[PDB]
Motif scaffolding. Structure first.
Motif, PDB file in Angstrom:
ATOM      1  N   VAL A  33      -5.507  16.376  -2.566  1.00  0.00           N
ATOM      2  CA  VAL A  33      -6.546  17.144  -3.264  1.00  0.00           C
ATOM      3  C   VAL A  33      -7.829  17.239  -2.413  1.00  0.00           C
ATOM      4  CG1 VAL A  33      -5.652  16.524  -5.561  1.00  0.00           C
ATOM      5  CG2 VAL A  33      -7.462  15.125  -4.519  1.00  0.00           C
ATOM      6  N   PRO A  34      -8.529  18.395  -2.451  1.00  0.00           N
ATOM      7  CA  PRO A  34      -9.768  18.602  -1.672  1.00  0.00           C
ATOM      8  C   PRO A  34     -10.821  17.509  -1.931  1.00  0.00           C
ATOM      9  CG  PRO A  34      -9.046  20.666  -2.652  1.00  0.00           C
ATOM     10  CD  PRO A  34      -8.172  19.591  -3.241  1.00  0.00           C
ATOM     11  N   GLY A  35     -11.096  16.702  -0.907  1.00  0.00           N
ATOM     12  CA  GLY A  35     -12.013  15.574  -1.054  1.00  0.00           C
ATOM     13  C   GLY A  35     -11.407  14.244  -0.607  1.00  0.00           C
ATOM     14  N   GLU A  36     -10.081  14.125  -0.703  1.00  0.00           N
ATOM     15  CA  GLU A  36      -9.374  12.902  -0.290  1.00  0.00           C
ATOM     16  C   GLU A  36      -9.588  12.571   1.191  1.00  0.00           C
ATOM     17  OE1 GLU A  36      -7.562  10.364  -1.509  1.00  0.00           O
ATOM     18  OE2 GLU A  36      -8.119  10.996  -3.527  1.00  0.00           O
ATOM     19  N   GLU A  37      -9.626  11.279   1.497  1.00  0.00           N
ATOM     20  CA  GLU A  37      -9.680  10.812   2.881  1.00  0.00           C
ATOM     21  C   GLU A  37      -8.301  10.317   3.324  1.00  0.00           C
ATOM     22  OE1 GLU A  37     -13.360   8.409   1.731  1.00  0.00           O
ATOM     23  OE2 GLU A  37     -13.782   8.830   3.835  1.00  0.00           O
ATOM     24  N   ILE A  38      -7.663  11.083   4.193  1.00  0.00           N
ATOM     25  CA  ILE A  38      -6.303  10.792   4.648  1.00  0.00           C
ATOM     26  C   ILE A  38      -6.291  10.273   6.097  1.00  0.00           C
ATOM     27  CG2 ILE A  38      -6.000  13.218   5.328  1.00  0.00           C
ATOM     28  CD1 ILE A  38      -3.031  12.930   4.932  1.00  0.00           C
ATOM     29  N   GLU A  39      -5.629   9.142   6.312  1.00  0.00           N
ATOM     30  CA  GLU A  39      -5.488   8.562   7.653  1.00  0.00           C
ATOM     31  C   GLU A  39      -4.004   8.425   8.036  1.00  0.00           C
ATOM     32  OE1 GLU A  39      -7.630   4.810   6.295  1.00  0.00           O
ATOM     33  OE2 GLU A  39      -5.869   3.866   7.186  1.00  0.00           O
ATOM     34  N   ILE A  40      -3.651   8.911   9.225  1.00  0.00           N
ATOM     35  CA  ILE A  40      -2.276   8.809   9.724  1.00  0.00           C
ATOM     36  C   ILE A  40      -1.962   7.374  10.169  1.00  0.00           C
ATOM     37  CG2 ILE A  40      -0.594   9.645  11.427  1.00  0.00           C
ATOM     38  CD1 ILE A  40      -1.427  11.754   9.381  1.00  0.00           C
ATOM     39  N   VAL A  41      -0.848   6.829   9.689  1.00  0.00           N
ATOM     40  CA  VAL A  41      -0.449   5.461  10.030  1.00  0.00           C
ATOM     41  C   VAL A  41       0.494   5.436  11.242  1.00  0.00           C
ATOM     42  CG1 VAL A  41       0.490   3.284   9.128  1.00  0.00           C
ATOM     43  CG2 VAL A  41      -0.598   4.928   7.570  1.00  0.00           C
ATOM     44  N   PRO A  49       9.050  13.648  10.181  1.00  0.00           N
ATOM     45  CA  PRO A  49       7.795  13.643   9.391  1.00  0.00           C
ATOM     46  C   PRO A  49       6.748  12.610   9.854  1.00  0.00           C
ATOM     47  CG  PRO A  49       9.515  12.493   8.198  1.00  0.00           C
ATOM     48  CD  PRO A  49      10.179  13.090   9.408  1.00  0.00           C
ATOM     49  N   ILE A  50       5.522  12.766   9.349  1.00  0.00           N
ATOM     50  CA  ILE A  50       4.429  11.831   9.637  1.00  0.00           C
ATOM     51  C   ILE A  50       4.082  10.999   8.391  1.00  0.00           C
ATOM     52  CG2 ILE A  50       3.404  13.250  11.478  1.00  0.00           C
ATOM     53  CD1 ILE A  50       3.194  14.948   9.175  1.00  0.00           C
ATOM     54  N   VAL A  51       3.823   9.706   8.586  1.00  0.00           N
ATOM     55  CA  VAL A  51       3.456   8.818   7.476  1.00  0.00           C
ATOM     56  C   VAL A  51       1.939   8.592   7.431  1.00  0.00           C
ATOM     57  CG1 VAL A  51       3.787   6.534   6.418  1.00  0.00           C
ATOM     58  CG2 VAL A  51       5.698   7.656   7.608  1.00  0.00           C
ATOM     59  N   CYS A  52       1.321   9.013   6.333  1.00  0.00           N
ATOM     60  CA  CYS A  52      -0.136   8.928   6.170  1.00  0.00           C
ATOM     61  C   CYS A  52      -0.519   8.099   4.937  1.00  0.00           C
ATOM     62  CB  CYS A  52      -0.720  10.335   6.039  1.00  0.00           C
ATOM     63  SG  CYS A  52      -0.073  11.277   4.639  1.00  0.00           S
ATOM     64  N   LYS A  53      -1.817   7.849   4.770  1.00  0.00           N
ATOM     65  CA  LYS A  53      -2.329   7.107   3.609  1.00  0.00           C
ATOM     66  C   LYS A  53      -3.225   7.984   2.723  1.00  0.00           C
ATOM     67  CE  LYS A  53      -4.119   3.055   4.340  1.00  0.00           C
ATOM     68  NZ  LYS A  53      -5.089   2.176   5.046  1.00  0.00           N
ATOM     69  N   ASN A  56      -4.677   4.948  -0.997  1.00  0.00           N
ATOM     70  CA  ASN A  56      -4.144   3.627  -0.625  1.00  0.00           C
ATOM     71  C   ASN A  56      -2.623   3.655  -0.340  1.00  0.00           C
ATOM     72  OD1 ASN A  56      -3.074   0.646  -1.400  1.00  0.00           O
ATOM     73  ND2 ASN A  56      -5.172   0.497  -0.680  1.00  0.00           N
ATOM     74  N   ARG A  57      -1.890   4.569  -0.978  1.00  0.00           N
ATOM     75  CA  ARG A  57      -0.425   4.612  -0.843  1.00  0.00           C
ATOM     76  C   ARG A  57       0.019   5.481   0.349  1.00  0.00           C
ATOM     77  NH1 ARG A  57      -2.285   7.722  -4.798  1.00  0.00           N
ATOM     78  NH2 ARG A  57      -1.586   9.831  -5.030  1.00  0.00           N
ATOM     79  N   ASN A  58       1.141   5.110   0.967  1.00  0.00           N
ATOM     80  CA  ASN A  58       1.678   5.850   2.116  1.00  0.00           C
ATOM     81  C   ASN A  58       2.549   7.039   1.679  1.00  0.00           C
ATOM     82  OD1 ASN A  58       1.467   2.758   3.065  1.00  0.00           O
ATOM     83  ND2 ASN A  58       1.119   4.088   4.811  1.00  0.00           N
ATOM     84  N   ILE A  59       2.182   8.240   2.124  1.00  0.00           N
ATOM     85  CA  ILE A  59       2.938   9.461   1.807  1.00  0.00           C
ATOM     86  C   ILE A  59       3.637  10.030   3.058  1.00  0.00           C
ATOM     87  CG2 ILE A  59       2.806  11.828   0.895  1.00  0.00           C
ATOM     88  CD1 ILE A  59       2.245   9.643  -1.187  1.00  0.00           C
ATOM     89  N   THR A  60       4.936  10.307   2.939  1.00  0.00           N
ATOM     90  CA  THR A  60       5.706  10.929   4.026  1.00  0.00           C
ATOM     91  C   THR A  60       5.614  12.459   3.953  1.00  0.00           C
ATOM     92  OG1 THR A  60       7.335   9.088   4.048  1.00  0.00           O
ATOM     93  CG2 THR A  60       7.980  11.147   5.131  1.00  0.00           C
ATOM     94  N   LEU A  61       4.955  13.064   4.935  1.00  0.00           N
ATOM     95  CA  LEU A  61       4.666  14.503   4.907  1.00  0.00           C
ATOM     96  C   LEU A  61       5.330  15.225   6.103  1.00  0.00           C
ATOM     97  CD1 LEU A  61       2.806  17.184   5.085  1.00  0.00           C
ATOM     98  CD2 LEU A  61       3.200  16.138   2.846  1.00  0.00           C
ATOM     99  N   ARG A  62       5.745  16.481   5.903  1.00  0.00           N
ATOM    100  CA  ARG A  62       6.415  17.264   6.966  1.00  0.00           C
ATOM    101  C   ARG A  62       5.408  18.205   7.659  1.00  0.00           C
ATOM    102  NH1 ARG A  62      10.686  13.992   5.096  1.00  0.00           N
ATOM    103  NH2 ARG A  62       9.798  13.521   3.095  1.00  0.00           N
ATOM    104  N   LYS A  63       5.595  18.490   8.957  1.00  0.00           N
ATOM    105  CA  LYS A  63       4.639  19.347   9.695  1.00  0.00           C
ATOM    106  C   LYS A  63       4.432  20.703   9.004  1.00  0.00           C
ATOM    107  CE  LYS A  63       5.973  19.543  14.046  1.00  0.00           C
ATOM    108  NZ  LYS A  63       7.205  18.715  14.144  1.00  0.00           N
ATOM    109  N   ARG A  64       5.524  21.319   8.544  1.00  0.00           N
ATOM    110  CA  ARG A  64       5.450  22.612   7.846  1.00  0.00           C
ATOM    111  C   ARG A  64       4.383  22.591   6.729  1.00  0.00           C
ATOM    112  NH1 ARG A  64       9.229  23.548   2.777  1.00  0.00           N
ATOM    113  NH2 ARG A  64       8.803  21.609   1.749  1.00  0.00           N
TER     114      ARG A  64
END
Length: 162
Positions: A33-41, A49-53, A56-64
């Motif tokens: 959501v617009p405002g979140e601070e996301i850091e790549i782990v 895919p890339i694993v980010c935070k 606090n929780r780790n989300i697995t996201l695809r480049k697309r």
């Protein structure tokens, strides 16, 4: 700046999501959501895919999907290869003394206003030998002198498909 290319460890804030319908609800469902601070782990060695935070929780996201989320480096400064566009100012290098030697002889000492174009960067009209791998080791800040010409902003879209 999209999180699909964000340096693992560097925090970035969600500007906006260039996508709506089906995927958009998946994203907000995971926390995008617009405002979140996301850091790549950590990133898959093959690309994604890339694993980010997020939250606090780790989300697995695809480049697309990642190319749809425009983020901003909260660290205050960012590497050339991941830069937005226009005129920048060099803040620091990362490497060894011979690595620095190249930069000093190339034209990037300190405070220099460097321009971003395609796969080469310009120091006062002098092209620098930086395409990708080394380009992420040079960190700059967005100054925008406004003395030179404007450019077509680079907005990226990979929606619905994979």
């Amino acid at each position: 700046m999209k999180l699909s290319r964000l340096v693992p460890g560097v925090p970035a804030r969600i500007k906006r999501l260039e996508v709506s319908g089906e995927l958009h609800e998946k994203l907000v469902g995971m926390g995008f959501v617009p405002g979140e601070e996301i850091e790549i782990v950590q990133v898959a060695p093959l690309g994604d895919p890339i694993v980010c935070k997020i939250g606090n929780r780790n989300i697995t996201l695809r480049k697309r999907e990642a190319d749809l989320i425009e983020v901003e480096v909260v660290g205050g400064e960012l590497p050339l290869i991941l830069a937005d566009d226009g005129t920048y100012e060099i803040t620091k290098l990362n490497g060894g003394r011979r690595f620095l030697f190249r930069m000093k002889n190339l034209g990037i000492e300190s405070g220099k206003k460097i321009q971003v174009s395609g796969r080469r960067y310009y120091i006062e009209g002098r092209e620098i030998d930086l395409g990708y791998g080394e380009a992420t080791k040079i960190w700059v800040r967005r100054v925008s002198d406004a003395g030179e010409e404007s450019h077509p902003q680079k907005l990226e879209h990979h929606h619905h498909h994979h």
